């Protein structure tokens, strides 16, 4: 606020979808060319994800869609309550 895209790192319990949103919003706010923003995405998006999501994304291999990446990482982090609350 302003935040550098270099500093966006996924929290240990932050859902990967929340991290993708924060990464996108921070990169959108950066005053930079599209070429520089694309290099930042290629260099930082997976690299700054948390260890559990990096493990999953490494196993997916290159060329996944963002939908495939978010579906693969959906179970990491987020709410800690897993049992029948209801």
């Amino acid at each position: 606020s302003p935040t550098s895209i270099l500093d966006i790192r996924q929290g240990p319990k932050e859902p990967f979808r929340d991290y993708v949103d924060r990464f996108y919003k921070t990169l959108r706010a950066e005053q930079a060319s599209q070429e520089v923003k694309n290099w930042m995405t290629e260099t930082l998006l997976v690299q700054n994800a948390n260890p559990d999501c990096k493990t999953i994304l490494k196993a997916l291999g290159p060329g996944a869609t963002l939908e495939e990446m978010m579906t693969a990482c959906q179970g990491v982090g987020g709410p800690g309550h897993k049992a029948r609350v209801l």
Partner: nanobody
Amino acid sequence: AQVQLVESGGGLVQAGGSLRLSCAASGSFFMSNVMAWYRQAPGKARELIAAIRGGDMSTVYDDSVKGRFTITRDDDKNILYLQMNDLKPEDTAMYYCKASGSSWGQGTQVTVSS
């Protein structure tokens, strides 16, 4: 944000001149994989003009500095550099470096006359 940065190398030059900016990282024997240079002129947002990643040494530049500026990193000294050639009055700004998770430095002023 633990690693501390500090820029040097700015000054007043005539159009067509050259400067070499240095950014010294302290607080670690190492620097983050990605580092960048930002340009900030009065009344404007900071602009991400050059970046580098360790390992493959890939770099990227804003179109306004292509063919004139070069970003390099020396991990044996913990210094990031910006070689600025063929300076233009529109390059006048405060220049700041950044590393992932680092604190911000005080920047260095570059003033280009004509």
